[PDB]
Protein backbone atom coordinates (compact mmCIF):
# COMPACT_ATOMS: atom_id res chain seq x y z
CA UNK A 1 0.00 0.00 0.00
CA UNK A 2 1.23 3.49 -0.83
CA UNK A 3 1.28 6.73 1.17
CA UNK A 4 -1.69 8.65 -0.22
CA UNK A 5 -1.22 11.90 1.69
CA UNK A 6 2.39 12.83 0.97
CA UNK A 7 3.08 15.43 -1.77
CA UNK A 8 2.64 14.39 -5.42
CA UNK A 9 6.23 14.35 -6.67
CA UNK A 10 5.70 16.11 -10.00
CA UNK A 11 3.75 18.95 -8.37
CA UNK A 12 6.90 20.04 -6.54
CA UNK A 13 8.45 20.71 -9.95
CA UNK A 14 5.49 22.27 -11.73
CA UNK A 15 7.43 25.50 -12.32
CA UNK A 16 10.45 23.68 -13.75
CA UNK A 17 9.58 20.62 -15.82
CA UNK A 18 7.38 17.51 -15.90
CA UNK A 19 8.51 14.52 -13.83
CA UNK A 20 7.99 11.16 -15.52
CA UNK A 21 8.45 7.44 -15.00
CA UNK A 22 9.08 4.36 -17.12
CA UNK A 23 6.39 1.71 -16.80
CA UNK A 24 5.49 -1.92 -17.57
CA UNK A 25 2.06 -2.49 -19.20
CA UNK A 26 1.23 -5.11 -16.57
CA UNK A 27 1.38 -2.54 -13.76
CA UNK A 28 -1.42 -0.19 -14.81
CA UNK A 29 -4.51 -1.66 -13.12
CA UNK A 30 -6.36 0.69 -10.75
CA UNK A 31 -6.00 -1.72 -7.82
CA UNK A 32 -2.28 -2.26 -8.44
CA UNK A 33 -0.16 -0.32 -5.91
CA UNK A 34 2.49 0.35 -8.57
CA UNK A 35 -0.16 1.97 -10.77
CA UNK A 36 -1.36 4.03 -7.81
CA UNK A 37 2.18 5.28 -7.25
CA UNK A 38 2.47 6.04 -10.98
CA UNK A 39 -0.71 8.13 -11.19
CA UNK A 40 0.00 9.95 -7.94
CA UNK A 41 3.56 11.11 -8.47
CA UNK A 42 4.10 11.54 -12.18
CA UNK A 43 2.70 13.66 -14.99
CA UNK A 44 4.80 12.03 -17.73
CA UNK A 45 5.15 8.38 -18.80
CA UNK A 46 7.55 6.31 -20.88
CA UNK A 47 7.34 2.67 -21.96
CA UNK A 48 10.24 0.84 -20.32
CA UNK A 49 10.05 -1.81 -23.08
CA UNK A 50 6.73 -1.77 -24.94
CA UNK A 51 7.82 0.70 -27.64
CA UNK A 52 11.21 -0.82 -28.45
CA UNK A 53 11.65 -2.27 -31.95
CA UNK A 54 11.19 -5.94 -31.01
CA UNK A 55 8.13 -4.97 -29.00
CA UNK A 56 6.49 -3.23 -31.95
CA UNK A 57 7.50 -5.30 -35.00
CA UNK A 58 8.64 -8.79 -33.88
CA UNK A 59 8.53 -10.20 -37.41
CA UNK A 60 8.46 -8.19 -40.66
CA UNK A 61 5.13 -6.50 -41.28
CA UNK A 62 3.67 -7.96 -38.08
CA UNK A 63 3.12 -4.97 -35.79
CA UNK A 64 2.18 -5.51 -32.15
CA UNK A 65 1.00 -2.21 -30.64
CA UNK A 66 -1.34 -3.53 -27.93
CA UNK A 67 1.01 -3.09 -24.95
CA UNK A 68 2.20 0.31 -26.16
CA UNK A 69 -1.40 1.43 -26.69
CA UNK A 70 -2.34 0.24 -23.20
CA UNK A 71 0.32 2.57 -21.80
CA UNK A 72 -0.82 5.40 -24.07
CA UNK A 73 -4.46 4.94 -23.00
CA UNK A 74 -3.36 5.04 -19.37
CA UNK A 75 -1.37 8.24 -19.99
CA UNK A 76 -4.39 9.89 -21.60
CA UNK A 77 -6.66 8.80 -18.74
CA UNK A 78 -4.29 10.41 -16.23
CA UNK A 79 -3.50 13.57 -18.20
CA UNK A 80 0.15 12.60 -18.58
CA UNK A 81 2.50 13.48 -21.41
CA UNK A 82 4.77 10.78 -22.86
CA UNK A 83 8.19 10.16 -24.36
CA UNK A 84 8.52 7.55 -27.09
CA UNK A 85 11.34 5.05 -26.47
CA UNK A 86 12.80 4.15 -28.92
CA UNK A 87 12.91 3.94 -32.74
CA UNK A 88 16.42 2.47 -33.06
CA UNK A 89 18.80 0.64 -30.73
CA UNK A 90 21.27 -2.26 -30.90
CA UNK A 91 19.40 -4.26 -28.26
CA UNK A 92 15.79 -5.48 -28.32
CA UNK A 93 15.67 -5.19 -32.10
CA UNK A 94 14.74 -8.32 -34.12
CA UNK A 95 17.40 -10.11 -36.14
CA UNK A 96 15.17 -10.03 -39.24
CA UNK A 97 15.97 -6.34 -39.76
CA UNK A 98 19.56 -7.22 -40.54
CA UNK A 99 19.05 -10.35 -42.60
CA UNK A 100 18.69 -10.85 -46.35
CA UNK A 101 15.16 -12.34 -46.48
CA UNK A 102 16.07 -14.60 -49.41
CA UNK A 103 19.25 -15.81 -47.68
CA UNK A 104 19.16 -15.24 -43.88
CA UNK A 105 22.80 -16.34 -43.74
CA UNK A 106 23.67 -13.03 -45.42
CA UNK A 107 23.17 -9.45 -44.23
CA UNK A 108 20.60 -7.05 -45.60
CA UNK A 109 21.96 -4.37 -47.93
CA UNK A 110 22.29 -0.70 -46.99
CA UNK A 111 19.22 0.13 -49.09
CA UNK A 112 17.14 -2.69 -47.65
CA UNK A 113 18.02 -1.87 -44.04
CA UNK A 114 17.31 1.82 -44.66
CA UNK A 115 13.94 1.00 -46.24
CA UNK A 116 13.11 -1.20 -43.26
CA UNK A 117 14.12 1.57 -40.87
CA UNK A 118 11.98 4.05 -42.78
CA UNK A 119 8.98 1.70 -42.76
CA UNK A 120 9.37 0.94 -39.06
CA UNK A 121 9.72 4.58 -38.02
CA UNK A 122 6.93 5.74 -40.32
CA UNK A 123 4.53 2.99 -39.28
CA UNK A 124 5.23 3.58 -35.60
CA UNK A 125 4.69 7.34 -35.77
CA UNK A 126 1.71 7.01 -38.15
CA UNK A 127 0.14 4.50 -35.75
CA UNK A 128 0.02 6.90 -32.83
CA UNK A 129 -0.94 9.86 -34.99
CA UNK A 130 -3.80 8.03 -36.72
CA UNK A 131 -5.13 6.19 -33.68
CA UNK A 132 -4.89 9.01 -31.14
CA UNK A 133 -4.75 12.16 -33.24
CA UNK A 134 -4.77 15.36 -31.20
CA UNK A 135 -4.95 13.23 -28.04
CA UNK A 136 -1.57 11.57 -28.73
CA UNK A 137 0.32 12.22 -25.46
CA UNK A 138 3.74 11.51 -26.96
CA UNK A 139 5.64 14.78 -27.26
CA UNK A 140 8.83 13.33 -28.65
CA UNK A 141 10.88 10.25 -29.48
CA UNK A 142 14.32 8.88 -28.77
CA UNK A 143 14.96 8.42 -32.50
CA UNK A 144 18.29 6.69 -31.92
CA UNK A 145 19.46 5.18 -28.66
CA UNK A 146 23.02 4.58 -27.39
CA UNK A 147 24.76 5.03 -30.73
CA UNK A 148 28.12 5.89 -29.16
CA UNK A 149 30.55 3.38 -27.68
CA UNK A 150 32.50 3.75 -24.41
CA UNK A 151 35.33 5.57 -26.19
CA UNK A 152 33.11 8.06 -27.97
CA UNK A 153 33.37 6.38 -31.36
CA UNK A 154 30.21 5.30 -33.16
CA UNK A 155 29.09 1.97 -31.71
CA UNK A 156 29.73 -0.77 -34.28
CA UNK A 157 26.20 -2.16 -34.28
CA UNK A 158 24.67 -3.90 -37.29
CA UNK A 159 23.19 -0.51 -38.21
CA UNK A 160 26.70 0.96 -38.58
CA UNK A 161 28.10 -2.17 -40.21
CA UNK A 162 25.45 -2.43 -42.91
CA UNK A 163 24.61 1.22 -43.62
CA UNK A 164 27.52 3.33 -42.52
CA UNK A 165 27.71 6.46 -40.31
CA UNK A 166 24.79 8.28 -41.92
CA UNK A 167 22.22 5.82 -40.59
CA UNK A 168 21.74 8.26 -37.70
CA UNK A 169 20.91 11.21 -39.97
CA UNK A 170 18.57 8.96 -41.94
CA UNK A 171 16.65 7.90 -38.82
CA UNK A 172 16.01 11.54 -37.88
CA UNK A 173 15.05 12.37 -41.46
CA UNK A 174 12.49 9.56 -41.55
CA UNK A 175 11.03 10.46 -38.16
CA UNK A 176 10.77 14.15 -39.00
CA UNK A 177 8.98 13.40 -42.26
CA UNK A 178 6.58 10.99 -40.55
CA UNK A 179 5.54 13.47 -37.85
CA UNK A 180 7.00 17.00 -37.74
CA UNK A 181 5.12 17.70 -34.50
CA UNK A 182 7.41 15.33 -32.59
CA UNK A 183 10.52 16.55 -30.76
CA UNK A 184 13.38 14.28 -31.93
CA UNK A 185 16.05 13.12 -29.48
CA UNK A 186 19.36 11.27 -29.56
CA UNK A 187 19.55 9.41 -26.22
CA UNK A 188 22.58 8.01 -24.41
CA UNK A 189 24.21 7.03 -21.13
CA UNK A 190 27.50 8.15 -19.55
CA UNK A 191 27.34 11.46 -21.43
CA UNK A 192 26.86 13.11 -18.02
CA UNK A 193 30.40 12.24 -16.86
CA UNK A 194 32.15 15.03 -18.83
CA UNK A 195 34.52 12.50 -20.36
CA UNK A 196 35.31 11.42 -23.91
CA UNK A 197 31.75 10.23 -24.47
CA UNK A 198 30.29 13.62 -23.49
CA UNK A 199 32.65 15.30 -25.94
CA UNK A 200 31.74 12.78 -28.64
CA UNK A 201 28.02 13.42 -28.21
CA UNK A 202 28.66 17.14 -28.41
CA UNK A 203 30.76 16.73 -31.57
CA UNK A 204 28.22 14.43 -33.22
CA UNK A 205 25.21 16.63 -32.58
CA UNK A 206 27.10 19.76 -33.59
CA UNK A 207 28.05 18.10 -36.86
CA UNK A 208 24.60 16.74 -37.65
CA UNK A 209 22.71 19.89 -36.69
CA UNK A 210 25.06 21.99 -38.81
CA UNK A 211 24.24 19.63 -41.69
CA UNK A 212 20.54 20.30 -41.23
CA UNK A 213 19.60 17.06 -39.45
CA UNK A 214 16.37 17.68 -37.51
CA UNK A 215 17.67 16.89 -34.02
CA UNK A 216 15.70 18.80 -31.39
CA UNK A 217 17.29 17.52 -28.23
CA UNK A 218 19.69 15.27 -26.39
CA UNK A 219 18.45 12.73 -23.88
CA UNK A 220 20.88 12.11 -21.02
CA UNK A 221 19.84 8.72 -19.61
CA UNK A 222 21.48 9.61 -16.32
CA UNK A 223 21.98 6.06 -15.08
CA UNK A 224 24.21 7.51 -12.38
CA UNK A 225 25.75 5.92 -9.32
CA UNK A 226 26.18 6.67 -5.64
CA UNK A 227 29.69 7.86 -6.57
CA UNK A 228 28.76 10.17 -9.46
CA UNK A 229 30.29 13.65 -9.46
CA UNK A 230 27.79 16.52 -9.56
CA UNK A 231 30.42 18.86 -11.00
CA UNK A 232 30.87 16.58 -14.01
CA UNK A 233 27.12 16.34 -14.56
CA UNK A 234 26.82 20.14 -14.45
CA UNK A 235 29.69 20.56 -16.92
CA UNK A 236 28.12 17.97 -19.25
CA UNK A 237 24.71 19.63 -19.22
CA UNK A 238 26.29 23.00 -19.96
CA UNK A 239 28.42 21.66 -22.80
CA UNK A 240 25.59 19.77 -24.48
CA UNK A 241 23.16 22.66 -23.92
CA UNK A 242 25.47 25.03 -25.82
CA UNK A 243 24.31 23.33 -29.03
CA UNK A 244 20.90 24.96 -28.82
CA UNK A 245 19.01 21.72 -28.25
CA UNK A 246 16.63 20.73 -25.44
CA UNK A 247 18.03 18.48 -22.76
CA UNK A 248 15.90 15.82 -21.10
CA UNK A 249 16.97 13.54 -18.23
CA UNK A 250 15.47 10.35 -19.55
CA UNK A 251 16.23 7.27 -17.47
CA UNK A 252 17.29 8.51 -14.07
CA UNK A 253 18.25 5.99 -11.41
CA UNK A 254 21.09 5.53 -8.96
CA UNK A 255 23.30 2.44 -8.88
CA UNK A 256 24.26 1.80 -5.26
CA UNK A 257 27.01 -0.66 -6.15
CA UNK A 258 25.63 -3.26 -3.75
CA UNK A 259 25.44 -1.00 -0.70
CA UNK A 260 21.80 -0.57 0.32
CA UNK A 261 22.58 0.17 3.96
CA UNK A 262 20.82 2.93 5.88
CA UNK A 263 23.99 5.05 5.67
CA UNK A 264 24.01 4.59 1.90
CA UNK A 265 20.37 5.66 1.69
CA UNK A 266 21.28 8.90 3.49
CA UNK A 267 24.16 9.49 1.08
CA UNK A 268 21.75 8.77 -1.76
CA UNK A 269 19.37 11.42 -0.40
CA UNK A 270 22.12 14.05 -0.27
CA UNK A 271 23.21 13.23 -3.84
CA UNK A 272 19.68 13.26 -5.25
CA UNK A 273 19.12 16.60 -3.53
CA UNK A 274 22.20 18.09 -5.16
CA UNK A 275 21.16 16.56 -8.47
CA UNK A 276 17.71 18.11 -8.49
CA UNK A 277 19.06 21.46 -7.30
CA UNK A 278 21.26 21.31 -10.40
CA UNK A 279 18.35 20.36 -12.65
CA UNK A 280 16.27 23.25 -11.30
CA UNK A 281 19.20 25.61 -11.80
CA UNK A 282 19.34 24.44 -15.43
CA UNK A 283 15.61 24.73 -16.11
CA UNK A 284 16.28 26.96 -19.12
CA UNK A 285 17.65 23.83 -20.84
CA UNK A 286 15.99 20.82 -19.21
CA UNK A 287 12.45 20.12 -20.39
CA UNK A 288 11.77 16.81 -18.62
CA UNK A 289 13.15 14.51 -15.91
CA UNK A 290 12.11 10.85 -16.04
CA UNK A 291 12.92 8.05 -13.57
CA UNK A 292 13.68 4.59 -14.96
CA UNK A 293 11.19 2.61 -12.90
CA UNK A 294 8.38 3.20 -10.40
CA UNK A 295 9.99 1.70 -7.29
CA UNK A 296 13.10 -0.22 -6.24
CA UNK A 297 11.43 -3.64 -6.48
CA UNK A 298 10.76 -3.19 -10.21
CA UNK A 299 14.10 -1.61 -11.14
CA UNK A 300 16.01 -3.15 -14.06
CA UNK A 301 19.25 -3.12 -12.05
CA UNK A 302 20.43 -6.44 -10.61
CA UNK A 303 20.04 -7.06 -6.88
CA UNK A 304 20.83 -5.91 -4.35
CA UNK A 305 19.79 -2.36 -5.29
CA UNK A 306 17.84 0.71 -4.11
CA UNK A 307 18.00 3.10 -7.11
CA UNK A 308 14.84 5.20 -6.92
CA UNK A 309 12.79 7.49 -4.66
CA UNK A 310 10.37 4.76 -3.58
CA UNK A 311 11.58 1.55 -1.94
CA UNK A 312 10.76 -2.13 -2.44
CA UNK A 313 7.71 -1.64 -0.20
CA UNK A 314 6.62 1.35 -2.31
CA UNK A 315 7.37 3.78 0.53
CA UNK A 316 9.01 7.18 0.10
CA UNK A 317 12.74 6.97 0.82
CA UNK A 318 15.04 9.60 2.37
CA UNK A 319 15.81 10.80 -1.16
CA UNK A 320 12.14 11.60 -1.74
CA UNK A 321 11.95 13.80 1.33
CA UNK A 322 15.27 15.49 0.53
CA UNK A 323 13.92 16.57 -2.86
CA UNK A 324 10.42 17.59 -1.78
O1 LIG B 1 18.08 3.09 -23.16
C2 LIG B 1 18.34 1.83 -22.51
C3 LIG B 1 17.06 1.33 -21.87
O4 LIG B 1 16.10 1.01 -22.88
C5 LIG B 1 17.35 0.08 -21.05
O6 LIG B 1 16.12 -0.34 -20.44
C7 LIG B 1 16.18 -1.72 -20.04
C8 LIG B 1 16.32 -2.61 -21.27
O9 LIG B 1 16.35 -3.98 -20.86
C10 LIG B 1 15.12 -4.38 -20.24
O11 LIG B 1 15.23 -5.75 -19.84
C12 LIG B 1 14.81 -6.65 -20.87
C13 LIG B 1 13.29 -6.68 -20.92
O14 LIG B 1 12.86 -7.62 -21.92
C15 LIG B 1 13.27 -8.95 -21.59
O16 LIG B 1 12.77 -9.86 -22.58
C17 LIG B 1 14.78 -9.04 -21.53
O18 LIG B 1 15.16 -10.36 -21.11
C19 LIG B 1 15.31 -8.04 -20.52
O20 LIG B 1 16.75 -8.03 -20.52
C21 LIG B 1 14.88 -3.55 -18.99
O22 LIG B 1 13.59 -3.89 -18.46
C23 LIG B 1 14.89 -2.07 -19.33
O24 LIG B 1 14.80 -1.31 -18.12
O25 LIG B 1 18.32 0.40 -20.03
C26 LIG B 1 19.56 0.77 -20.64
C27 LIG B 1 19.39 2.05 -21.44
O28 LIG B 1 20.64 2.36 -22.08
List of E strands, the chain:
19-23, 44-47, 81-85, 99-100, 103-107, 138-145, 183-188, 217-220, 223-225, 246-255, 286-291
Q: What is the dihedral sign for C-alpha 95, 101, 103, 106?
A: negative
Q: Are strands 99-100 and 103-107 parallel, antiparallel or unpaired?
A: antiparallel
CA of 299 to the centre of ligand 1 (A): 10
CA of 281 to the centre of ligand 1 (A): 30
Residue nearest to atom 18 of ligand 1 (CA): 92
In short, whether 146's Cβ falls inside 6 Å of ligand 1 is yes
CA of 130 to the centre of ligand 1 (A): 28
List of E strands, 99-200:
99-100, 103-107, 138-145, 183-188
In short, whether 145's Cβ falls inside 6 Å of ligand 1 is yes
DSSP state of 207: H
In short, whether 179's Cβ falls inside 6 Å of ligand 1 is no
Which candidate, 218, 224, 147, places its Cα nearest to that of 193? 224
The CATH number linked to 67 is 3.20.20.80
Catalytic residue IDs: 251
Contact 142, 183 (CB under 8 A): no
In short, whether 221's Cβ falls inside 6 Å of ligand 1 is yes
- Residue 315 phi/psi, 5-degree rounding, is -95, 150
Residue nearest to atom 6 of ligand 1 (CA): 48
Contact 187, 142 (CB under 8 A): yes
Tell me whether residue 285 is exposed, middle or buried, using C-beta atoms within 10 angstroms of its C-beta: 0 to 12, 13 to 18, 19 or more.
Answer: buried
Which candidate, 52, 63, 62, 60, places its Cα nearest to that of 101? 60
DSSP state of 7: P
Show the domain range for 117: 1-324
Which atom, in ligand 1's list, is nearest to the CA of 293? Answer: 24
End-to-end CA distance of the chain: 21
In short, whether 96's Cβ falls inside 6 Å of ligand 1 is no
In short, whether 132's Cβ falls inside 6 Å of ligand 1 is no
DSSP state of 280: H
Instruction: Find out whether the peptide bond into 304 is cis, omega within 30 degrees of 0.
Output: yes
CB atoms within 10 A of CB 70: 16
**How many residues are listed for the chain in this entry?**
324
- Residue 223 phi/psi, 5-degree rounding, is -85, 80
Which candidate, 289, 192, 280, 206, places its Cα nearest to that of 237? 192
> Which approach determined this entry?
X-ray
Instruction: Find out whether the peptide bond into 86 is cis, omega within 30 degrees of 0.
Output: yes
Which candidate, 205, 289, 214, 208, places its Cα nearest to that of 239? 205
Which atom, in ligand 1's list, is nearest to the CA of 292? Answer: 24
Q: What is the dihedral sign for C-alpha 297, 302, 305, 309?
A: negative
Distances (CA, A) of 61 to 85, 116, 122, 164, 280: 20, 10, 12, 24, 44
Residue nearest to atom 11 of ligand 1 (CA): 300
In short, whether 55's Cβ falls inside 6 Å of ligand 1 is no
Number of domains in the chain: 1
Q: Are strands 19-23 and 44-47 parallel, antiparallel or unpaired?
A: parallel
**Best residue among 24, 90, 92 to mutate for probing ligand 1, ranked by most atoms within 8 Å of CB:** 92
CA of 300 to the centre of ligand 1 (A): 7
**Best residue among 300, 302, 305 to mutate for probing ligand 1, ranked by most atoms within 8 Å of CB:** 300
d(CA 275, CA 269): 10
In short, whether 188's Cβ falls inside 6 Å of ligand 1 is no
Contacts 24+ apart (CB under 8 A), 159-166: 159/88, 159/90, 159/113, 159/117, 161/107, 162/98, 162/107, 162/108, 162/109, 162/110, 162/113, 163/110, 163/113, 163/114, 164/110
In short, whether 48's Cβ falls inside 6 Å of ligand 1 is yes
Amino acid sequence: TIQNDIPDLYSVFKDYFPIGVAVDPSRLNDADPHAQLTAKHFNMLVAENAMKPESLQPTEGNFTFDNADKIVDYAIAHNMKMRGHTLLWHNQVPDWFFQDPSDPSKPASRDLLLQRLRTHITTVLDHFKTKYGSQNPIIGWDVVNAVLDDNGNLRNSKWLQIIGPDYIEKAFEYAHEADPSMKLFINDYNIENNGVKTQAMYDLVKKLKNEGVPINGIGMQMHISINSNIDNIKASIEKLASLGVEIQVTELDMNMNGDVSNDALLKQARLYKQLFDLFKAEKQYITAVVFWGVSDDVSWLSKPNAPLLFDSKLQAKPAYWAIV
